[PDB]
Amino acid sequence: TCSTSDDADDPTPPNERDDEAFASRVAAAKRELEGTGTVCQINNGETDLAAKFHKSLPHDDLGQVDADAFAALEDCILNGDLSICEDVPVGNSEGDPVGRLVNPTAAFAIDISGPAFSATTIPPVPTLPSPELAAQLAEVYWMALARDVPFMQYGTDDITVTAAANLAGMEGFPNLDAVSIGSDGTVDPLSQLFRATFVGVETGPFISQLLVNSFTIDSITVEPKQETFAPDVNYMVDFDEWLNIQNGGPPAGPELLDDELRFVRNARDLARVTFTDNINTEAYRGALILLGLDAFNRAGVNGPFIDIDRQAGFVNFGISHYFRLIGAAELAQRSSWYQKWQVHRFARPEALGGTLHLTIKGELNADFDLSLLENAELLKRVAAINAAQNPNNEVTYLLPQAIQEGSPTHPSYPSGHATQNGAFATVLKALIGLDRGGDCYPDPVYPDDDGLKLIDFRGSCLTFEGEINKLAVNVAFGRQMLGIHYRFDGIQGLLLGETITVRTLHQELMTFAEESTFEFRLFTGEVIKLFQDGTFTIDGFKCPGLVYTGVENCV
Amino acid sequence: QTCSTSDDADDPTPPNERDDEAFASRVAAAKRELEGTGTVCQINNGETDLAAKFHKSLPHDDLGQVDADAFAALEDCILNGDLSICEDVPVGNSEGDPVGRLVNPTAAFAIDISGPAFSATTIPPVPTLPSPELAAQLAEVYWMALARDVPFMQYGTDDITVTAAANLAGMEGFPNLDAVSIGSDGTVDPLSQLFRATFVGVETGPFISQLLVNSFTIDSITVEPKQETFAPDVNYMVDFDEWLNIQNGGPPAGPELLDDELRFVRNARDLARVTFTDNINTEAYRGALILLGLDAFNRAGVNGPFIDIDRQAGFVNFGISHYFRLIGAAELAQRSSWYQKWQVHRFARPEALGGTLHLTIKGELNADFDLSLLENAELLKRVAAINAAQNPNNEVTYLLPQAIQEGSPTHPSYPSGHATQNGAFATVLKALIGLDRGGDCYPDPVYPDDDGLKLIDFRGSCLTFEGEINKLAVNVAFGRQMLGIHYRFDGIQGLLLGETITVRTLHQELMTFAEESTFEFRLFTGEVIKLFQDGTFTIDGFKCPGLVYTGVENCV
Numbered sequence A: 001t002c003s004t005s006d007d008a009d010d011p012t013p014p015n016e017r018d019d020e021a022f023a024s025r026v027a028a029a030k031r032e033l034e035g036t037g038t039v040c041q042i043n044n045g046e047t048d049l050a051a052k053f054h055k056s057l058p059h060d061d062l063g064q065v066d067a068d069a070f071a072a073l074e075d076c077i078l079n080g081d082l083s084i085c086e087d088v089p090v091g092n093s094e095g096d097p098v099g100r101l102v103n104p105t106a107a108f109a110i111d112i113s114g115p116a117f118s119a120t121t122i123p124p125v126p127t128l129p130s131p132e133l134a135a136q137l138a139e140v141y142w143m144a145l146a147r148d149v150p151f152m153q154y155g156t157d158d159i160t161v162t163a164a165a166n167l168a169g170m171e172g173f174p175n176l177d178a179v180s181i182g183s184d185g186t187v188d189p190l191s192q193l194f195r196a197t198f199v200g201v202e203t204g205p206f207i208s209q210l211l212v213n214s215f216t217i218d219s220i221t222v223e224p225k226q227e228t229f230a231p232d233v234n235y236m237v238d239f240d241e242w243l244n245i246q247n248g249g250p251p252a253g254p255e256l257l258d259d260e261l262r263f264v265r266n267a268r269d270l271a272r273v274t275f276t277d278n279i280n281t282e283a284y285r286g287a288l289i290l291l292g293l294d295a296f297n298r299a300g301v302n303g304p305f306i307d308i309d310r311q312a313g314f315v316n317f318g319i320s321h322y323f324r325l326i327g328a329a330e331l332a333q334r335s336s337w338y339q340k341w342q343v344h345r346f347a348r349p350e351a352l353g354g355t356l357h358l359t360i361k362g363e364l365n366a367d368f369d370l371s372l373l374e375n376a377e378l379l380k381r382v383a384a385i386n387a388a389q390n391p392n393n394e395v396t397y398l399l400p401q402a403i404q405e406g407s408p409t410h411p412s413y414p415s416g417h418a419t420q421n422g423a424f425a426t427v428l429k430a431l432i433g434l435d436r437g438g439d440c441y442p443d444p445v446y447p448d449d450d451g452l453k454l455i456d457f458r459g460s461c462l463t464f465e466g467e468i469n470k471l472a473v474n475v476a477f478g479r480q481m482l483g484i485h486y487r488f489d490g491i492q493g494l495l496l497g498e499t500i501t502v503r504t505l506h507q508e509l510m511t512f513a514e515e516s517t518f519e520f521r522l523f524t525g526e527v528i529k530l531f532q533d534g535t536f537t538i539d540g541f542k543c544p545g546l547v548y549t550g551v552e553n554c555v
Numbered sequence B: 001q002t003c004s005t006s007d008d009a010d011d012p013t014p015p016n017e018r019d020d021e022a023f024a025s026r027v028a029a030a031k032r033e034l035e036g037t038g039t040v041c042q043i044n045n046g047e048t049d050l051a052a053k054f055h056k057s058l059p060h061d062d063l064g065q066v067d068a069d070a071f072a073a074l075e076d077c078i079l080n081g082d083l084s085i086c087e088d089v090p091v092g093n094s095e096g097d098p099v100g101r102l103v104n105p106t107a108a109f110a111i112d113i114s115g116p117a118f119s120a121t122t123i124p125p126v127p128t129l130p131s132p133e134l135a136a137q138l139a140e141v142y143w144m145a146l147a148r149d150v151p152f153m154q155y156g157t158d159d160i161t162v163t164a165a166a167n168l169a170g171m172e173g174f175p176n177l178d179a180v181s182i183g184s185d186g187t188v189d190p191l192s193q194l195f196r197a198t199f200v201g202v203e204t205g206p207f208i209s210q211l212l213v214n215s216f217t218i219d220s221i222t223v224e225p226k227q228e229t230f231a232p233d234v235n236y237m238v239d240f241d242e243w244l245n246i247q248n249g250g251p252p253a254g255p256e257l258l259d260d261e262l263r264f265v266r267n268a269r270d271l272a273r274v275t276f277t278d279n280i281n282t283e284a285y286r287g288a289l290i291l292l293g294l295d296a297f298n299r300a301g302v303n304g305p306f307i308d309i310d311r312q313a314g315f316v317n318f319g320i321s322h323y324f325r326l327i328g329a330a331e332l333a334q335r336s337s338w339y340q341k342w343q344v345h346r347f348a349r350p351e352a353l354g355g356t357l358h359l360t361i362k363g364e365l366n367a368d369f370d371l372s373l374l375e376n377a378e379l380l381k382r383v384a385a386i387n388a389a390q391n392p393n394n395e396v397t398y399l400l401p402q403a404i405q406e407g408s409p410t411h412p413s414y415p416s417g418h419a420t421q422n423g424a425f426a427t428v429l430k431a432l433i434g435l436d437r438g439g440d441c442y443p444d445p446v447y448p449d450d451d452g453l454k455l456i457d458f459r460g461s462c463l464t465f466e467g468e469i470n471k472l473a474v475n476v477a478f479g480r481q482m483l484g485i486h487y488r489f490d491g492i493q494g495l496l497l498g499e500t501i502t503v504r505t506l507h508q509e510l511m512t513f514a515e516e517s518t519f520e521f522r523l524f525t526g527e528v529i530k531l532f533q534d535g536t537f538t539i540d541g542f543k544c545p546g547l548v549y550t551g552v553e554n555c556v
């Protein structure tokens, strides 16, 4: 049995390989220790249970949570114990899986890699009475009303031309997260409504090139015409059906589907993608397309290999590296879960929709800002679309859901889809690099209004990095378009995802033998550059912390 | 805001101790890896002949023998984890084609914070060039090339595969091949054993996994797996000059000829084509979506510890996030595969031993291949004839016909990186699905017809999910062998390396989870592993003595 020598072409002796791996890992962990320090989780401080998540617990007939049950939920959230979590009351005893709490104890796991779950933060949510919460909630209502308008008709359809005038008139609107908006405060329906200022999202067609172009997987070429939802029908707008879903009961039935396969061409379609995706499916498709277009090089001439001739990357700076992180970067979901349950615990849009509807009916008196509560233009359209749908044409102002089950049984903020899509977009941009990130997407297209044919897009350069960012914001805002998240869930989850992913990316980069760096553009536009000694820059400026904690701290 | 002992998080640990607690847990995890690893000795087969070593893309003489100083430059490149030193390795062809680049030789030297470090695991020494095991390993690769265009359901009648099976069973070292599928009577049944392995389920039912031939749905897009495949009969690198050009790092002679009709995978050439055009985990990702849709893994999160309780579902842990996260993350096993390829065994590819074989048969070289191969009359006459029909002026060569013009990637043979990653992904799918559901039968199994244009319903065996998951991994490993670029030891040892490594990572993560939970599933060779949060583990119910898992043979 060997000790100081063996057959490997390795400078370290066998009996030191174990110590060197330990030393390296202790140092890495020490760097997270020191770079982290004391991190303070802060929520908006409101105590109203109406603004908190409690879907699936027992509610009275006004959708108001049972006190004892909510206190058992707080018990469950705090203790990271399965058994205590099984003690939380359920509001419907039929045992349907949509009634189960979605893994409330998940956050309490220290992963050995990346930033620990409590090492990052996201901002407090706007309180229920605020002008910002009002405009955020109205925007989810207008998305629901605009679901069947084709994206290319946004500038001429009554619903979206109105949505843009009505939202721009709300006091809180200019304060919405990365809101697309003119300098004069107006909203252009075709290029700004339901958009964000992250790089490339406002340029060109609403839907990312990565969602409408063909992809090849194992020599199988796939055109992305999907099975989509039927137009014009929404769910949970009948009061008893809505209450039953808040109490944890089964959906009223399946969703109506369209008989014709179509490319994604309106918000209902985009929402459909996000209802039937599985973690990184959209980003995986984008990854394959980018590889096929040579934004990422399949033969491995990426990273430090672009400047040399003898070697190609694979495990590092090649497809092994890329597809590994496309899955591994989903680890940011653990931090997303801590934020959802242990910290913010914010009410989903359908729950606030119930509070609103009852307040409008005079059965509750929630303090919503008058910009929503007196928003006649929006509330009359909601009343009308619901009455058209409901038995006996009964009017409700509930938020129309594109799915019978409504939201998943976990808190609104942030969106897990937005956190994981921010992480996947960051992995793609970092491996493709800044230079290739700025090249223009070749032969860009947009689906026709029926989603049956692709039309050649003739306009500004759509950069690879912008189309990757667009893909991520499409997925985030597609959940909003189902009725189950607000813009703050999507924007702040995307940033949470980018920050955590820069931390893991930098951690791994420091271990690699070959000399190399990472360089790429963040969602807000700054260029980050990561170095193997632990240093990093934002637009050329060397940052002061030991580890990346967001652009705001690099000053 | 600042804070110290209290903030708005419902977390028992004060903010100012959360950094400390994460460092403590990480040190304890790294320490468990330190103490469970100890001294690990990397042992290769010890042969010194350069003909038995990888040196594709370096300068060679006209007999394909490596320039000696270039090879010592490559060893220095392998040893030092230095990009600049690796840029000094000589190249045998100046055209600058990307197929000539060395594939990331410094990759192994990176200590990943999670999982087993790159040098903490081993794979067995490769059979030496003169051994009967090597001879039968290489003959199998050649028979796979000769059987490329035979539809799997015609294996029992086609003279090529009927003879392959008998020829291989009569080779002295054949019975000692890695998990070789063979009767107790010593014969190989063409339909159910030829080019198969004894890993659970692989020998049951059709050759191709159900996960590769059934439709998958992605984002509401339903996909029928009819692929663009290679044309029949044509093989490449069978003309000596073309072969030599490829060994010196020159560009491929041309593109591969493709079939005009899209088809399901129905022969070895088609399975090879999958593996030529896949991307790390595309085959398992397709299988993962198929399994999820069949409820072998529950999309709503009723998996792992949630199966026995009513109030909660899994997601980050024991739900789809866990599942898709690990399907990509488990590719981390590729760092260890890279160490074994370059730093430890550095074994020559089948096309390289094929050039040595060819030249030895012609009397231009004198390699000591065992006589079971050098005097295999049945194999030699068929190789000569297929190559004479392919070559322009009908010149005979004994080179191993490749299914692709560029031949192997530019990195050593052992183990197969495709096999190591598919052993890891197979291991992730089984662990998350769990032992009980792993035993459920595939619901609607099929097999493609001989033209690969229609799916025929299969009957007469329960194809378990764990068995079809194992089959897919062995199909991907063996499809590289069907390209002409890997041996069976590359594939089976690669699959087992990927499994051990993944068990180590799965266990490490399991120990962190707040909820009480375990992992329990069946390994490739059939034993049931069960992993516990206190760091202990069992093999068929027997408590293992090591700190950490190091393979079935050490749990005794």
Ligand code: VO4
Pocket: A407, A408, A412, A414, A415, A416, A417, A418, A479, A484, A485
């Ligand atoms: O998955 V959301 O967290 O986007 O409901």
Ligand code: VO4
Pocket: B408, B409, B413, B415, B416, B417, B418, B419, B480, B485, B486
């Ligand atoms: O990728 V192989 O290592 O299977 O050539």
